[PDB]
Hints:
Chains A, B: One of its GO terms (cellular component) is extracellular region. The structure is a homodimer of 382-residue chains. Chain A has helices spanning 37-43, 59-71, 79-85, 114-128, 131-140, 170-176, 179-191, 216-223, 235-238, 241-249, 286-293, 309-313, 361-380; strands spanning 8-11, 48-50, 73-76, 90-94, 107-112, 156-162, 258-262, 264-265, 267-269, 275-277, 320-322, 335-337, 341-342. The first copy, chain A, has 382 residues and is an alpha/beta fold. Chain A has a 7-stranded parallel sheet with strand order 2-1-5-6-7-12-11, sandwiched between helices. In chain A, strand 9 (267-269) and strand 10 (275-277) form a beta hairpin. In chain A, helix 2 (59-71) packs across helix 4 (114-128) and helix 6 crosses helix 11. The A-B interface holds A 279, 283, 354-355, 357-358 and B 279-280, 283, 354-355, 357-358. One chloride ion (CL) binds at residues 102, 146, 152 of chain B.
Amino acid sequence: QPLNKYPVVFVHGFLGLVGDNAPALYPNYWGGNKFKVIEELRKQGYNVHQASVSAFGSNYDRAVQLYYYIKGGRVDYGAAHAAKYGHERYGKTYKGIMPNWEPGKKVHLVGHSMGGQTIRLMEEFLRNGNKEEIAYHQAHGGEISPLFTGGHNNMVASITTLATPHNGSQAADKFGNTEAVRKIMFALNRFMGNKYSNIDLGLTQWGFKQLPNESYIDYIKRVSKSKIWTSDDNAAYDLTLDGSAKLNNMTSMNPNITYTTYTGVSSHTGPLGYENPDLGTFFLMDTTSRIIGHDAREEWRKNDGVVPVISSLHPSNQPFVNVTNNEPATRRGIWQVKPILQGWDHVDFIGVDFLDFKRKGSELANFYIGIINDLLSVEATE
Amino acid sequence: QPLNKYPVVFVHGFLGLVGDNAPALYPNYWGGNKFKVIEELRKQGYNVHQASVSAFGSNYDRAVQLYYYIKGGRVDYGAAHAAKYGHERYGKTYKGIMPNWEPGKKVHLVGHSMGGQTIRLMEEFLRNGNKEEIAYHQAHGGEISPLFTGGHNNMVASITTLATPHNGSQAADKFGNTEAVRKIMFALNRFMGNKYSNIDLGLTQWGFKQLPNESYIDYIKRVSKSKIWTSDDNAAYDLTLDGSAKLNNMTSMNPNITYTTYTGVSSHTGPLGYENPDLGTFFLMDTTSRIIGHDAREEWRKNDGVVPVISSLHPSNQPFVNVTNNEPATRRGIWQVKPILQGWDHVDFIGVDFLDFKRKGSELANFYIGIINDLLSVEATE
Ligand SMILES: CCCCCCCCCCC/C=C\CCCCC(=O)O
Ligand SMILES: CCCCCCCCCCC/C=C\CCCCC(=O)O
Ligand SMILES: CCCCCCCCCCCC(=O)O
Ligand SMILES: CCCCCCCCCCCC(=O)O
Ligand SMILES: CCCCCCCC(=O)O
Ligand SMILES: CCCCCCCC(=O)O
Ligand SMILES: CCCCCCCC(=O)O
Ligand SMILES: CCCCCCCC(=O)O
Ligand SMILES: CCCCCC(=O)O
Ligand SMILES: CCCCCC(=O)O
Ligand SMILES: CCCCCC(=O)O
Ligand SMILES: CCCCCC(=O)O
Ligand SMILES: [Ca+2]
Ligand SMILES: [Ca+2]
Ligand SMILES: [Cl-]
Ligand SMILES: [Cl-]
Ligand SMILES: [Cl-]
Ligand SMILES: [Cl-]
Ligand SMILES: [Mg+2]
Ligand SMILES: [Zn+2]
Ligand SMILES: [Zn+2]
């Protein structure tokens, strides 16, 4: 007897590790020490979960993983996809949170940042399938994942995104996706693939798991042959303006789903009309904020630390409507864009900014309970 | 050659590590990344140095070390002192920054925080010697350090203190000096005495140095017999109200020395009249600020994070005069108390608050150059 008829699945963004897969010391992703989203919402009678998917992988890989996290089973990225990008077809295997998920039994999906993109792709696959996989299985036989078939409707009630870079971010184009920083990211992944590691950073399909009897030297040599080093099939690429536009171009509005976005601002206009980070922007986002805020295009400047406002409001090529705080958020098939949260940086959405005393736990509690109320109303107005 | 005729020696406080004795990653003590005090002042033609003395030891041990840091030589804490407290008489040996230091060759001394206390004790020793050591050498023969003899004047031109707890701090009484935290401090010292350690936290005279062939187990066993665990001859005790009052009671004014203090405030009055830390107080001082700011005695509440205003202005019951920022600070024999620096927490004085964007490098450069100007004034008005 949970208060919500459909399970709520929260989906972390880039870099996020949750649950058993978080290091020895590491912030609690959903709520920090400010408001324990999963535990508190459960205490209040809601059925909620935190998905665990690849921290460094592509929206594609993450979306497949999200599917298996919900459904249960062995991750299948698709034969065509695997062959085209050069990684394993099969990945980890998940218990499944709802082994009976199928048209009729729905789920609410809420994504922070990159999580918001991942959620869109996965629903796209359920509804319209994956044509390269359909064609490949046509040509060559074998099994095709039900995720890639198409024709699955009535499985997701709602898509809600928080500080999602629907239109990408310059912090990716000018930093995250540069050569030097991809190497840093991939080296970290190589290291955390070592044979004593208990944490999965989400690129093992690329070879980054040291065998028990393999020397580190041999490991280095083996994985430097991996295609990961030059591939676009990774998070860094997908977070770029181009990477995100590509996803926008292959997604579409499902008319039965309730769509809603939230966006934060944590910059202010300086005398030349550039944006600089507010005191209170989590300090690791200082430089990324400046890079965004000093864009040549004025409307690309205001930002939450790492995502510009124009990126987070809605996918630029998809229908939207500006909504008030008080309107029921119950319209289907159109991005309901919630009023910008002033002073909320990118990570204030998940409560991990331990340096920022203006953003209190009770505020964060209200924000999350507000999302649940909207979700309840989606249910009530079916 | 140098603009200043007398060398400036900067003396760090409690916990401070400088130069080669700082860990692989560690803040630059004098100026952070905001204004590199030693390097910049040298570039501008001033002769300046940063003393290196015990980070965890007593004002006594630190003051002896300061002497040898300047003069050069093997640290001699005194036979009477060693026997009374139960630690080695002899300590490290220093090259010496001014091997010819003697009456006639003077030095300017500037102390941050505890450094301000250490500087007072060392001048006390030069001028008046150390009675227990004089008596001990009377009774028993031996050599006595010239530091403990008394009669050495015309060696220090000036004493300037920044955020010095001249009257102690409740953050020591109610936290720093509790049993639980002395154990933490002493364990850290034991650990950093291990045979692979390249940093000296300043308590080796208590036995915290593992021998090359000693096992860690034997080391633990040996040093747990040390008197350090129950002694008052350590920084934690000296920083308490009582500990500091004892130093106050054995110091006296030198009529040739120019004395000046700076003090910061980084708390604000709440309802009820208690003080709480400003946003912008370096976050590690949050709790210590509250402890101070909630004192029963109202005049002990305003604080810089870890030292209350009333402790920093001047030693209580020593002569002082409130001074303006503009006028020459050129009086001898009396504590010239500079106007409180509004918004400056304890570590803003040394530029290491990397989270605090209100406290700019150019501001800190002005602050230091201001001190040098006063020091130049002292020289010019001899
Ligand atoms: C090391 C590279 C960082 C570069 C930043 C790239 C652009 C980021 C845009 C949006 C990020 C998406 C998910 C962010 C989740 C943040 C989670 C966390 O910090 O614990
Ligand atoms: C670990 C125990 C902390 C207890 C705090 C006791 C009160 C201290 C008052 C004044 C201390 C002297 C100097 C502070 C120097 C700051 C050095 C640094 O931040 O690297
Ligand atoms: C916080 C630790 C930073 C150390 C960076 C140096 C490591 C360079 C690359 C290492 C790659 C690997 O170990 O496989
Ligand atoms: C980051 C701090 C790690 C805390 C570990 C606690 C260890 C207890 C005291 C150790 C004493 C010693 O090793 O000599
Ligand atoms: C020594 C442990 C290293 C943990 C790496 C943290 C992964 C991340 O930033 O997502
Ligand atoms: C460098 C610290 C620990 C190294 C473990 C080596 C195990 C192995 O490779 O067989
Ligand atoms: C831009 C600054 C980067 C420094 C990283 C390590 C921080 C530390 O060791 O305190
Ligand atoms: C895990 C400890 C690594 C070095 C220990 C020193 C060994 C020795 O005392 O011979
Ligand atoms: C963001 C913090 C990561 C540090 C991981 C660890 O030290 O176990
Ligand atoms: C190959 C074994 C060495 C790697 C394990 C480690 O990094 O602790
Ligand atoms: C998102 C992490 C960025 C680190 C860049 C910096 O500290 O300037
Ligand atoms: C291994 C690092 C030791 C830190 C020394 C200090 O806190 O002053
Ligand atoms: Ca913030
Ligand atoms: Ca500060
Ligand atoms: Cl299905
Ligand atoms: Cl792993
Ligand atoms: Cl002498
Ligand atoms: Cl040592
Ligand atoms: Mg060293
Ligand atoms: Zn892939
Ligand atoms: Zn001593």
